[PDB]
């Protein structure tokens, strides 16, 4: 519970002298508050680690997941974006940035740009098909032409189970 | 004419008699016996190459057959570990 | 000195450095004002770079006894402003001793057709580490030790090399 | 602190290449280990031995909350991304011509694909 | 024969050696005046590069390293020293000094570059030293004590491709470079030497045909030739050629080339191995050629 | 003997033609490489070029060994541009890259000679080549992304470019701050190049953000770089390797926009 995490973090900050060493434990303090659903105490302990380890892609990704669990779309995206800047191997996180942008604004040139970046890391992916479809339905008559060529060219990579043949 | 090229000619029937001893429920025992067959022939070929006078051109195939079956032996060893882990997991 | 340059530290240094590089070294103490300015701001590496340019200019323009005495004591001020720095950063940076500071207000050089013939100024750069200020301090002191024995050598020594000096 | 000391024993040119490699193979210093690995098998081993040691350090430094420790293990080794495919591209970027010729023979090719 | 140029070396005293660099662009000479002198000699011009002083006795041989390691020279002296010298940025300084000998060091010779940067040195105590560059200025030394009785006079390396010694190697392994060298001495012996699998050095073969002190010995470069060949000279005025016709037999045969009226001091192979130069004690050089009959003919009388 | 007769009167390319009739491969390779290692000049003269084209285009001599020889010659004649080049005429990019990053990059940045440094870096950048270059992403790519960020602003300062391209510019600047952070600076110059690259990037970030925060359509004024939210500047400027007087006027520019965030928060 909260009070067990608080009792552990009190004795573990007692067994720490200097402020920067307390900040260096902040990542683990933040995980324990998240495992109690204390999301602001998690945010508050990960930010007090990040302000002492500015470059850890895991801490930025954990702050992004805490903003996703506070429905704060572009703050989840900014912390995920910063985690991709600090470790570009995260193809999954390039896709998760497209996933949270197309769920915020369909007109956003960043949504379309991060989908571009996700497709160029995962071709032949039905999750990337539907993230294109959700933009192209909103591009109107100019959308419909691109949607026909998409449907043909990605069915040519996977014949679909139902949806794309009906569409 | 090389001795090595004459000495490894059983293994085409020895691997068959080892396959006809096992099943998919003893499919690692099969590869551990394949390492014992290749390691036995590596032992035989080493115990010929270690007895060749240096520079006798004929033993070129004996040395290539030794290294080929030594790399085969350790490739059966590799298979016997990684495909056991991947099935247990 | 004490705090009159909020937003403005980039201008005050450029104003004093351009004024210093235009004027006579024996008429206005601008290099010592700029040294004191950088020292008050704990910018010991800029203070030492300014004092080393001053000692280099003094031997190359000002062939007098007091010009050799300021060369030695300004090289000393530069050297001790490197001894106050970690060996990670304890070095000075200069154009090579033959590259041209074309002095402020000089008309740019031309062809006979009247173009500004700005040749590509390849910045070949002298780097001097802590030993090299011990070396030119030792030689400036010895230019002065010769001047404090032979008053005629003063007309030469201020920009002499080590083997000339031997 | 012992690995930080063993890494420091790997990087002064006054230590023997083999003593630098001994302490490197126990402290993650691939960069001082590859200077002794003079077969294909030694070169695959150098990558895999340090990949395990680096991933072990990443799980330990995520799970074991130490105190008072004021020195780092090098960010070239703590910040190391690893994959199996990557190791078998780095084994084709090497200058060691022997490894580039052995990484074209039939069983060494099978060994790459069975590991993948 | 035709002269290209005539160097005045400014040496005040007897020259003991004169060796060019691998390209024939520079010359090194050494003397009883304790100096080694380096010259540019390009196109029949001549210029002093250095007067290298820093031996304390007469200098008895010089040797250039292979240019794969950069501009490096070795020299050996009466004072028991071997000095290694290097050009960096265009100035020459001492890059090593080895005093580990119990008398005068009479000869020096570099290994083939294929073995690494290794020097061999022969001494008047009877020993030989080997100096291996380990990296970033350091040198391993190995000392073969008592390598000759009475004293060691000359050292010369075997070329890194021993003829025939490749036929059993399947396509894609490295050559196992069997490091060897020859040495002559005041025991009347030539001896062949090899590195074994522990890195220790061993007397592989003896060669016995001179009736007096062996002055010098030189191994032939294995360019085009399928045999292994050595020349050696003596205090009884002989020169012997030695062939080894099968590298698996290790069996050497002595062929008398000539017998002069006085001492022979030095033997020097052409870079194409097809010609031998021979330094006679009447101050002369003679030049010698192998025929298609395998007979040795003079080309300077 | 005939190959030596051909070397002696200077027909060394025909000494190779004779030595190429050696049936023994191990002697044939050594004899040809050893002879090439003497005769290949650093001056790629009409006569050297005629012999090199004869050897490669008639005799099929592998050109690797002509430049192996020119590299052993470039070691003896000390030219480390022709050594690095002739060792790349043997193989790999890395020798040009690790020369550039130590001996050209820092002076070229200090001279604002970006368009020259780019002329090397975009020939090294292609994925056929950069995938073979050690330490590329923390060195050559950092200098090159800095130049291409300056080029894309040099262009947006001249044309009606879109929000999609300013999104790209902000992403390219944000990708660069925590990478100037990571440059292998060796010399007295490299630390200066890195820190005015950082000073330039801190102020590129301001101009890029005031184009993301233009004013409402009631005054036809130019877009203020001091109106930029502190909330988007400080998390990226707090990684830039800048001297303490450069960081002081940056911190004063950040208190200036913070005071505008407070005054336009009391109305």
Are C and E touching by the rule of 3+ CB pairs within 8 Å? no
The phi and psi torsions of D95 (rounded to 5 degrees) equal: -80, -15
Which chains are adjacent to chain D, needing at least 3 Cβ pairs under 8 Å? A, B, E
For A2-35, give one letter per residue: b (16+ CB within 10 A) or e: eeebeeebeebeeebeeeebbbbbbbbbbebbbe
F76 vs chain E: nearest CA distance in angstroms?
5
Chain A residues in contact with D67 by the CB 8 A cut-off are: 15-16, 21
Backbone angles phi, psi at E283, to 5 degrees: 65, 5
Closest residue to F31, CB basis, from E23, E68, E224: E224
Does residue E135 belong to the interface with chain D, where contact is any CB pair within 8 Å? yes
Pairing label, strands E252-259, E238-244: antiparallel
Residue showing tokens 């003829």: E163
CA–CA separation, C91 and C133 (whole Å): 9
Q: Is F46 exposed, middle or buried (0-12, 13-18, 19+ CB in 10 A)?
A: exposed
Taking any CB pair shorter than 8 Å as contact, residues of chain A touching chain D are 12, 15-17, 21, 25, 28, 87, 89
Taking an 8 Å cut-off on Cβ atoms, the answer to whether E67 and F76 are in contact is yes
Contact assignment for F167 to A54 by CB distance below 8 Å: no
Chains E and F touch (3+ CB pairs under 8 A): yes
DSSP chain C: --S--SS-HHHHHHHHHHHHHHS-TTT--HHHHHHHHHHHTT-HHHHHHHHHHHHHHHHHH--SHHHHHHHHHHHHHHHHHHHTS-TTT--EEEE-TTS----TTPPPPB-TT--B--------EEEE-HHHHHHHHHHHHHHHHHHTT-TTTHHHHTT--HHHH-
Cβ contacts below 8 Å, chain E against chain F, sum to: 47
Strand partners, E192: E182, E205
Q: Which residue of D has its CA nearest to E171?
A: D101
Question: Which residue segment(s) compose the domain that E250 sits in?
Answer: 13-300
Q: Are E125 and E103 in contact (CB under 8 A)?
A: yes
Are B and F close enough to touch, i.e. 3+ CB pairs under 8 angstroms? Answer: no
Give contacts of E 141-200 with F, CB under 8 A.
161, 163, 166, 175
Closest C-alpha to F37, from E47, E84, E223: E223
Q: Angle, to 10 degrees, between the axis of helix F230-237 and the axis of helix F190-210? A: 160
What DSSP letter does each residue of E43-54 carry, written as one string? GG--EEEEEEE-
E1 occurs within a structural domain: no
What resolution (Å)?
A: 12.0
Closest C-alpha among E68, E46, E149 to residue E115: E68
CA gap A129, A158 in Å, rounded: 11
- Could you give the angle at the alpha carbon of B14 between the alpha carbons of B12 and B20, nearest 5°? 105
Residue in D12, D14, D18, D35 to test binding to E, most E beta-carbons within 10 Å: D14
Give ∠ CA F25-F27-F33 in degrees, rounded to 5: 95
Chain F residues within an 8 Å CB radius of C92: 188
Is residue A163 classed as helix, strand or coil in its secondary structure? Answer: helix
Chain E residues touching residue B67 (CB < 8 angstroms):
170
Query: Comparing C-alpha atoms, which of D96, D112, E173, D29 is closest to residue F92?
Result: D96
Determine which helix (DSSP H) or strand (DSSP E) holds E60, and give its type and residue range: strand E59-64
Alpha carbons A112 and A91: distance in angstroms, whole number: 16
Is B in contact with D (3 or more beta carbon pairs below 8 Å)? yes
HSE-up (13 A, CA, CB side) for residue F42: 17
E91 within a domain of the structure (yes/no): yes
Tokens of F165: 């391209």
Contact (Cβ atoms closer than 8 angstroms) between residue F83 and residue F74: yes
Interface subset of B 43-72, CB within 8 angstroms of D: 68, 71-72
The answer to whether the beta carbons of residues E17 and E63 sit under 8 Å apart is: no
H-assigned helices in F163-243: 163-180, 190-210, 230-237
C-alpha dihedral (E249, E250, E255, E257), degrees to nearest 10: 140
Residues of E in contact with F38 (CB under 8 A): 22-23
What is the 3-state secondary structure of C101-128? Answer: CCCCCCCCCECCCCCECCCCCCCCEEEE
DSSP symbols for F16-66: HHHHTT-S-HHHHHHHHHHHHHHH--SS--HHHHHHHHHHHHTS---THHH
- Residue E4 located in a structural domain: no
**Touching chains, F (3+ CB pairs < 8 A):** A, C, E
Interface with chain A: mutation pick from F182, F235, F238, F241, highest number of A CBs within 10 Å:
F235
Q: CB neighbours of C154 closer than 8 A, spacing ≥ 6?
A: C63, C64, C65, C68, C147
* CB contact (8 A) between residue B82 and residue D114: yes
Gap from C44 CA to chain F (nearest CA, Å): 12
Tell me whether F24 touches chain E (CB under 8 Å).
yes
Q: Residue E132 has what DSSP assignment?
A: E
Give SS3 for E107: strand
Tell me, yes or no, if B62 comes closer than 8 A to chain E by beta carbon.
no
Residue E287 near residue E276, CB atoms below 8 Å: yes
CA C88 to chain centre: 22
User: What's the rounded Cα separation, in Å, for the pair E13 and D111?
Assistant: 68
Technique used by the depositors: cryo-EM
**Between chains, do F192 and C93 touch, taking CB under 8 Å as contact?**
yes
E154 inside domain: yes
Sign of CA dihedral F145, F150, F151, F152: positive
User: Among E74, E114, E295, E70, which residue's Cα sits nearest to residue E222?
Assistant: E114
Count Cα neighbours of A86 within 13 Å in the Cβ-side half-sphere: 20
Query: What angle do the packed helices F140-156 and F163-180 form, to 10 degrees?
Result: 150
> How many separate helices (H) and strands (E) can be counted in chain A?
11, 0
Q: How far apart are CA E113 and CA E115, in angstroms?
A: 5
In a 3-state reduction of DSSP, which class is residue E127?
A: coil
The neighbours of chain B, by the rule of 3 or more Cβ pairs under 8 Å, are D, E
Residue E7 belongs to some domain of the structure: no
Strands E105-110, E91-98: pairing is unpaired
Give the distance from residue F243's alpha carbon to the nearest chain C alpha carbon, in angstroms. 10
d(Cα A16, Cα A25) in Å, to the nearest integer? Answer: 9
Number of domains in chain E: 1
**C-alpha pair distances (Å), A3 with each of A9, A25, A36:** 10, 18, 9
Interacting residues of B88 by C-beta distance below 8 A, sequence separation 6+: none
F167/A86 touch (CB, cutoff 8 Å), yes or no: no
Q: Name the token pair of E244.
A: 């080894």
Which chains touch A (3+ CB pairs under 8 A)?
Answer: D, F
- Across the interface, whether the CB atoms of F4 and E222 are under 8 A apart is answered no
**Tokens found for residue B35:** 């390492």
Cβ atoms of C40 and C9 within 8 Å: the answer is no
How far apart are the C-alpha atoms of C4 and C27, rounded to whole Å? 26
Closest Cα in chain D, distance from residue A50 (Å): 15
How far off is chain F from A54, nearest CA to CA, in Å? 8
Which are the contacts of A157, defined by CB distance < 8 A and separation ≥ 6?
A123, A124
Neighbours of E146 (CB within 10 A): 10
Question: How many Cα neighbours within 13 Å face the side chain of F185?
Answer: 22
Q: Looking at the domain assignment, is residue E32 inside a domain?
A: yes
First-last CA distance in chain C = 44
List residues bridging with E91 in a β-sheet. E88
Which residue in E116, E132, E133, E135 has the most chain D C-beta atoms within 10 A of its own C-beta, making it the best mutation to test that interface?
E135
Q: F 77-116 residues with CB below 8 A of E?
A: 78
Whether the CB of D114 is below 8 Å from some CB of chain B: the reply is yes
d(CA D51, CA D30): 9
């Amino acid at each position: 519970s909260k009070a067990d995490v608080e009792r552990y973090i009190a004795s573990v900050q007692g067994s720490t002298p200097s402020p920067r060493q307390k900040s260096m434990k902040g990542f683990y303090f933040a995980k324990l508050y998240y495992e109690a659903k204390e999301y602001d105490l998690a945010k508050k302990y990960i930010c007090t680690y990040i302000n002492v380890q500015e470059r850890d892609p895991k801490a930025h990704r954990f702050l992004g997941l805490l903003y996703e669990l506070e429905e704060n779309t572009d703050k989840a995206v900014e912390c995920y974006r910063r985690s991709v800047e600090l470790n570009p191997t995260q193809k999954d996180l390039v896709l998760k940035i497209a996933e949270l942008l197309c769920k915020n604004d369909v007109t956003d040139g960043r949504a379309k740009y991060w989908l571009e970046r996700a497709a160029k890391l995962f071709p032949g992916s039905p999750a990337i098909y539907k993230l294109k479809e959700q933009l192209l339905d909103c591009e109107g008559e100019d959308g419909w032409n691109k949607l026909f060529d998409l449907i043909q060219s990605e069915l040519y990579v996977r014949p679909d189970d139902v949806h794309v043949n009906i569409r | 004419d090389d001795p090595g090229e004459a000495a490894s000619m059983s293994m085409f029937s020895d691997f068959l008699q080892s396959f006809l001893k096992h099943s998919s429920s003893t499919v690692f025992d099969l590869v551990e016996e394949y390492e014992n067959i290749c390691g036995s022939q590596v032992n035989i070929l080493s115990k010929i190459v270690s007895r060749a006078t240096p520079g006798l051109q004929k033993f070129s195939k004996t040395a290539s057959m030794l290294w080929l079956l030594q790399q085969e032996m350790v490739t059966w060893r590799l298979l016997a570990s990684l495909y056991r882990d991947r099935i247990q997991s | 000195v004490e705090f009159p340059y909020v937003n403005l530290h980039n201008e005050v240094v450029g104003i004093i450095e351009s004024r210093a590089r235009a004027v006579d070294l024996m008429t206005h103490n601008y290099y010592e004002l700029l040294y004191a300015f950088h020292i008050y701001r704990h910018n010991y590496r800029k203070a030492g770079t300014v004092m080393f340019e001053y000692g280099m200019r003094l031997g190359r323009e000002v062939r007098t006894l007091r010009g050799l005495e300021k060369q030695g004591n300004c090289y000393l001020a530069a050297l001790n402003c490197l001894r106050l720095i970690r060996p990670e950063y304890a070095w000075i940076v200069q154009p090579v001793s033959g590259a041209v500071y074309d002095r402020p207000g000089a008309s740019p050089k031309r062809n006979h057709d009247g173009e500004c013939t700005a040749a590509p100024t390849n910045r070949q750069i002298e780097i001097l580490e802590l030993e090299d200020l011990e070396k030119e301090c030792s030689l400036a002191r010895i230019r002065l030790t010769l001047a404090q024995h032979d008053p005629s050598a003063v007309a030469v020594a201020g920009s002499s090399s080590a083997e000339e000096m031997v | 602190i012992w690995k930080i000391s063993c890494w420091r024993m790997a990087e002064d040119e006054l230590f023997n290449r083999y003593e630098r490699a001994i302490y490197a193979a126990l402290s993650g210093n691939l960069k001082q280990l590859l200077p002794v690995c003079d077969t294909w098998e030694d070169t695959v081993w150098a990558y895999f031995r340090v990949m395990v040691d680096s991933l072990v350090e990443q799980e330990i430094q995520t799970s074991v909350a130490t105190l008072d420790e004021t020195e780092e293990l090098p960010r070239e080794y703590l910040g190391a991304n690893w994959t199996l495919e990557k190791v078998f591209e780095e084994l084709q970027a090497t200058d060691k011509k022997r490894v580039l010729e052995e990484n074209q023979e039939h069983y060494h090719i099978v060994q790459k694909f069975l590991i993948l | 024969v035709s002269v290209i140029n005539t160097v005045d070396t400014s040496h005040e005293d007897m020259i003991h050696d004169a060796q060019m660099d691998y390209y024939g662009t520079r010359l090194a000479t050494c003397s009883s005046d304790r100096s080694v002198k380096i010259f540019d000699v390009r196109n029949g011009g001549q210029i002093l590069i250095a007067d290298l002083r820093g031996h304390e006795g007469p200098v008895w041989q010089v040797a250039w390293a292979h240019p794969m390691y950069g501009n490096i020279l070795a020299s050996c002296s009466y004072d028991r020293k071997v000095i290694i010298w290097r050009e960096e940025n265009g100035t020459w300084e001492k890059s090593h000094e080895h005093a580990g000998h119990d008398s005068s060091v009479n000869s020096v010779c570099w290994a083939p570059h294929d073995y690494g940067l290794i020097l061999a040195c022969g001494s008047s105590d009877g020993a030989i030293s080997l100096l291996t560059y380990t990296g970033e200025g350091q040198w391993e030394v190995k000392k073969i004590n008592n390598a000759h009785t009475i004293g060691c006079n000359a050292v010369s390396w075997a070329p890194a491709v021993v003829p025939g010694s490749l036929i059993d190697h399947p396509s894609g392994q490295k050559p196992n470079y069997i490091k060897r060298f020859a040495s002559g001495g005041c025991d009347n012996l030539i001896k062949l030497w090899k590195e074994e699998e522990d890195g220790q050095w061993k007397e592989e073969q003896k060669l016995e045909a001179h009736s007096d002190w062996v002055r010098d010995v030189a191994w032939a470069p294995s360019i085009g030739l399928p045999t292994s060949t050595i020349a050696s000279c003596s205090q009884d005025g002989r020169v012997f050629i030695w062939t080894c016709d099968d590298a698996s037999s290790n069996t050497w045969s002595p062929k008398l080339l000539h017998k002069f009226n006085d001492v022979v001091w030095h033997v020097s192979w052409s870079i194409t191995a097809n010609i031998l130069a021979v330094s006679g004690g009447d101050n002369k050089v003679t030049l010698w050629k192998e025929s298609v009959d395998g007979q040795w003919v003079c080309i300077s009388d | 003997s005939y190959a030596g007769q051909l070397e002696s009167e200077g027909l060394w390319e025909w000494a190779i033609f004779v030595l190429l009739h050696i049936d023994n491969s191990g002697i044939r390779e050594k004899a040809v490489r050893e002879l090439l290692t003497r005769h290949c000049q650093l001056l790629e003269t009409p006569e050297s070029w005629a012999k090199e084209t004869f050897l490669t285009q008639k005799l099929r001599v592998p050109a690797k060994w002509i430049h192996e020889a020119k590299a052993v010659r470039a070691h003896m004649e000390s030219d480390k541009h022709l050594e690095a080049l002739c060792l790349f005429k043997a193989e790999h990019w890395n020798r040009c890259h690790k020369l550039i990053i130590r001996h050209l990059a820092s002076d070229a940045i200090i001279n604002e000679n970006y368009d020259y440094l780019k002329g090397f870096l975009e020939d090294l950048a292609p994925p056929e080549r950069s995938s073979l270059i050690q330490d590329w992403e923390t060195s050559g790519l950092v200098y090159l992304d800095y130049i291409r960020v300056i080029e894309m602003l040099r262009h947006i300062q001249q044309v009606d470019c879109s929000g999609n391209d300013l999104e790209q510019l902000h992403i390219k600047v944000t990708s660069l701050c925590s990478r100037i952070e990571q440059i292998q600076c060796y010399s007295a110059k490299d630390r200066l190049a890195q820190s005015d690259m950082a000073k330039r990037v801190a102020n590129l970030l301001r101009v890029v953000l005031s184009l993301h925060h233009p004013p409402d359509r009631t005054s036809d004024s130019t877009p203020d770089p001091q109106r930029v939210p502190l909330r988007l500047l400080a998390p990226h400027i707090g990684r830039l390797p800048m001297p303490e007087d450069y960081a002081m006027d940056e911190l004063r520019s950040l208190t200036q926009s913070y005071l505008r965030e407070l005054a336009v928060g009391s109305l």
